[PDB]
Write a protein that binds this DNA or RNA. Structure first.
Ligand SMILES: [K+]
Ligand SMILES: [K+]
Ligand SMILES: [Mg+2]
Ligand SMILES: [Mg+2]
Ligand SMILES: [Mg+2]
Ligand SMILES: [Mg+2]
Ligand SMILES: [Mg+2]
Ligand SMILES: [Mg+2]
Ligand SMILES: [Mg+2]
Ligand SMILES: [Mg+2]
Ligand SMILES: [Mg+2]
Ligand SMILES: [Mg+2]
Ligand SMILES: [Mg+2]
Ligand SMILES: [Mg+2]
Ligand SMILES: [Mg+2]
Ligand SMILES: [Mg+2]
Ligand SMILES: [Mg+2]
Ligand SMILES: [Mg+2]
Ligand SMILES: [Mg+2]
Ligand SMILES: [Mg+2]
Ligand SMILES: [Mg+2]
Ligand SMILES: [Mg+2]
Ligand SMILES: [Mg+2]
Ligand SMILES: [Mg+2]
Ligand SMILES: [Mg+2]
Ligand SMILES: [Mg+2]
Ligand SMILES: [Mg+2]
Ligand code: NA
Ligand code: NA
Ligand SMILES: [Zn+2]
Lengths: 99, 212, 44, 56, 101
RNA sequence: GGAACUUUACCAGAUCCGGACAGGAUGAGAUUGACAGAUUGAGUGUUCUUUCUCGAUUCCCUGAAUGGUGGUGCAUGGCCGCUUAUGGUCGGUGGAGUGAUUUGUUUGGUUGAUUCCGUCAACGGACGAGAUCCAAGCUGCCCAGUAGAAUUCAGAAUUGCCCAUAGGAUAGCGCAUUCGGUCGAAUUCUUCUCUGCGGGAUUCCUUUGUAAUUGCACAAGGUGAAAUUUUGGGCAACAGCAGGUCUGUGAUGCUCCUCAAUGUUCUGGGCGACACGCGCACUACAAUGUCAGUGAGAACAAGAAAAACGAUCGAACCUACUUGAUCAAAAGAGUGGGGAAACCCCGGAAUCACAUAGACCCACUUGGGACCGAGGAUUGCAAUUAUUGGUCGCGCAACGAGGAAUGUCUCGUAGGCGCAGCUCAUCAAACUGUGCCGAUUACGUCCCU
């Protein structure tokens, strides 16, 4: 099912902002695991792909595919969107952007 | 428990093939020319060879850090166990990958096949290559597809020594009419150090030393 | 592979529509008027 | 419901329907030797990178 | 105690360079050396049809992968052995350390 | 491409949205999911009755998008096959033609070779051929507690008069042999095994040979592990074919379908269906045999797992031994080992051998084992259209050497013989390799193609 729960969406978005990229295998029957700092949270792979499709169609991320694996990277528009969606403090950066 | 030697060697080779494909697609715009890695007990030290080094790095290494994150999550590398380096190609005219990518960009910018191909050949021979061959195929003129080949200099084709003296690369160009294939073959000169050449001379060349 | 103009025998099954119960939670609690003047509530 | 019925057979994970190429995701002519799990067509284009060399 | 070093690689030149480097460094320590044994070379063989569509003469491509293995036995403490194998190894060479009994 | 489901593209039906996003209409109740009852092939909320649950993720319709083993290989990329196993191919400058074009690249001898020598309006070049590369034979250094050997101690075994039921032929005539469980120690060593770089062969040596009458070479023999591309492979030019593949890919243009779908799942069926024709195999028609015994004996190779699941390992994989066994096979169990020169393994393969004093005796017969019956076990979620082994029946199935035609092949080859890998949960009459036993014929020709 592609009915993504809101808490699952926020956890994926929070992981996406912290580490600027998300890598997920292309399999409908699968699970994606993200560290999100402390603890570990798992989201179905089909639901992760559904969330990234919306961002891709909104020109908020860059998508790369190779060997059954997705590679999504937030661009400047996505980083600004992620900051506003999560209400992150201004001048908060992903680990890639961070010094 | 521990993987056998045959399984470990296969696992390393499959990892390199996937890493090669990922970097080939991600750094197509830059002059990606190859990748090497050296796994130690502490880190992995992946090294990326490119001509347009500054763009693969990005602003304060933003793009290279994004590449590190992609490789880290894909292969489940722990924190601090993976490091990425980028080094410029010493001679970009002797790299078939750099030239076939340059040819691909020129063709995609609506440039004449004859002008684009001879530009690659002229540049490659100006870099010291003994020979260069460029092939372009597909629907160039109309509905019917032709293959055009432009060559200059030396080129060996048979035997196995041509796999160390000739650098070859092929790419797909997606134009409006369909797909176009471009190939670049470069005959490398013999560098004594063996850096950008196979060091040893041609297998069928005999040189008589001048008496002192 | 082409459309063969399938002729169905059974009627077309409709799609499920979630029936809306206007203020459903209003009837999950009963308001009992207290002697003081307020009301009391309990789960039903 | 339908969620339990969805992809039930594929969840068993038995037969050629459960295996696929690690590159092309295709389920035809899979090379399972040494746990390569690569299609025979994809193997030819990636043999040199994996380490296999064509001699004799 | 006896420490065994196992050297395995796909490249014959790299596996010989690392093995000789370990032998030279161990000789400088004046430790007892059990000469580098050349284990049998194992070849991985994959034979596939050349065509991607099954048309024409059934021609085949034989792909081979060779694995080279060497072992050296050291009569030295693990501290001495550790600093013997502490140089810049060639890429593609795997050195494993085990303690015999 | 050895399809039970899956795969799967086909057929009969049922779900799912995996129609992003944008613009509008609903909306804190947008919506999601459901027990029971019946709908149904479904102890499938698919839908309904009836209720709760979830909650701004979604539903509604408009454009759009997406996926497709949908079309078109006569729109294409890439790859492969074939023209084409042979010796072929093209510039520059110069010569010759009004020009296409030609010369070079021709002719004689030689070579598998446009390989060489000579000649020569050509001269200089570039590819292919050759070389290179990988295996196989001889050999050097290196090397072993994942390979072996020889000696020395102790420990056990045979031990001399022996003549088979009829008992031949076949080495022996300072110290007699034997025991990988005797899992006994010790010492020494690299003949055998392992291999990263080397060595070694080249027409090198010899003919009152051939030829030369320069040369390039050739034929016999010698040397030698190997005597002519050493052997076997890999690679392999330039021009092409409307050859094959859109059923390998997130390789692709255009085009088609797109919410009761040609997308995608799930259930069942089919891809296996038989008056018949054809290609390629397997098994045979028996005595140079079939059975029942016994002996000695290869090589290439394969082997177990997650960011899961359990308490850094342990369980998947392959095996030995034991047990079942106080009574068939196939099984089923227990224990141990192996990441693979370490366990399997001293790899007891099958052709083969046996003076086995074994059975059969020329017959569709103890040849052949198609077809079918009954019990039982095993793989799997599922075995009916027998999945596959094993047991006993069936053998009274054709077949007694195959018309016209026709394939492949020159030495460790053909043919015969098994083994491993590959497909693989289960299933090789297939393929890819491997070793074993090992010939007849030719050493030519251009008659056929
Ligand atoms: K031709
Ligand atoms: K003829
Ligand atoms: Mg050749
Ligand atoms: Mg089958
Ligand atoms: Mg089905
Ligand atoms: Mg089926
Ligand atoms: Mg429903
Ligand atoms: Mg389909
Ligand atoms: Mg064609
Ligand atoms: Mg084509
Ligand atoms: Mg001229
Ligand atoms: Mg001319
Ligand atoms: Mg000519
Ligand atoms: Mg001749
Ligand atoms: Mg000639
Ligand atoms: Mg061609
Ligand atoms: Mg055609
Ligand atoms: Mg198409
Ligand atoms: Mg395809
Ligand atoms: Mg299409
Ligand atoms: Mg449908
Ligand atoms: Mg079929
Ligand atoms: Mg036919
Ligand atoms: Mg016999
Ligand atoms: Mg008979
Ligand atoms: Mg013929
Ligand atoms: Mg087959
Ligand atoms: Na060929
Ligand atoms: Na029987
Ligand atoms: Zn593939």
């Amino acid at each position: 099912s592609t009915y993504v729960p809101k808490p699952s969406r926020d956890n994926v978005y929070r992981f996406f902002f912290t580490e600027g990229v998300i890598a997920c295998k292309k399999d409908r029957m699968g699970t994606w695991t993200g560290t999100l700092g402390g603890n570990t949270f798992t989201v179905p792979c089909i639901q992760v792909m559904q969330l990234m499709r919306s961002l891709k169609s909104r020109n908020l991320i860059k998508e790369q595919y190779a060997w059954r694996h997705y590679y999504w990277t937030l661009n400047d528009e996505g980083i600004a969107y992620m900051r506003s969606y999560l209400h992150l403090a201004p001048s908060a950066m992903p680990n890639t952007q961070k010094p | 428990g521990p993987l056998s030697k045959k399984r470990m060697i296969i696992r390393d080779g499959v990892f390199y093939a996937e890493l090669f494909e990922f970097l080939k697609r991600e750094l197509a715009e830059e002059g990606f020319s190859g990748v090497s890695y050296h796994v130690t007990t502490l880190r992995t030290e992946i090294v990326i060879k490119a001509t347009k080094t500054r763009e693969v790095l990005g602003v304060n290494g933003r793009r290279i850090r994004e590449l590190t994150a992609c490789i880290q999550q894909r292969f489940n590398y722990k924190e601090g166990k993976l490091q990425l380096y980028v080094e410029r190609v010493e001679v970009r005219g002797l790299s078939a990958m750099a030239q076939v990518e340059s040819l691909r960009f020129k063709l995609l910018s609506n440039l004449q096949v004859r002008r684009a191909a001879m530009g690659i050949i002229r540049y490659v021979m100006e870099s010291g290559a003994k020979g260069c061959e460029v092939t372009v195929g597909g629907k160039i003129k109309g509905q019917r597809a032709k293959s055009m080949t432009f060559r200059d200099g030396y080129m060996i084709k048979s035997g196995t020594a041509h796999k160390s003296f000739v650098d070859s690369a092929c790419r797909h160009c997606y134009m409006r009419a369909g797909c176009i294939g471009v190939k670049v073959k470069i005959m490398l000169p013999g560098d004594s150090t063996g850096r950008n050449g196979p060091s040893e001379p041609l297998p069928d060349v005999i040189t008589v030393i001048e008496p002192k | 592979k082409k459309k063969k103009k399938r002729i169905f025998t059974k009627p077309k099954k409709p799609t499920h529509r979630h029936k809306l119960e206007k203020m459903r939670a209003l009837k999950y609690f009963k308001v009992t008027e207290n002697d003081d003047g307020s009301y009391k509530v309990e789960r039903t | 419901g339908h969620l339990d019925q969805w992809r039930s057979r594929q969840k068993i994970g038995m037969g050629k329907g459960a295996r696929c190429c690690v590159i092309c995701s295709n389920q035809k002519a899979l090379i399972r030797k040494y746990e390569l799990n690569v299609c025979r067509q994809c193997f030819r284009e990636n043999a040199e990178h994996i380490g296999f060399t064509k001699l004799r | 105690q006896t420490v065994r070093l196992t050297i395995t690689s796909r490249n014959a030149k790299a596996v010989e360079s690392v093995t000789s480097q370990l032998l030279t460094r161990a000789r400088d320590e004046k430790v007892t050396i059990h000469g580098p044994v050349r284990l049998p070379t194992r070849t991985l063989k994959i034979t596939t049809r050349k065509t991607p569509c099954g048309n024409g003469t059934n021609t085949w491509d034989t792909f081979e992968l060779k694995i080279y293995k060497r072992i050296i036995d050291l009569h030295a403490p693990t501290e001495q052995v550790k600093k013997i194998t502490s140089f810049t190894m060639e890429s593609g060479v795997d050195v494993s350390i085990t303690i015999l009994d």
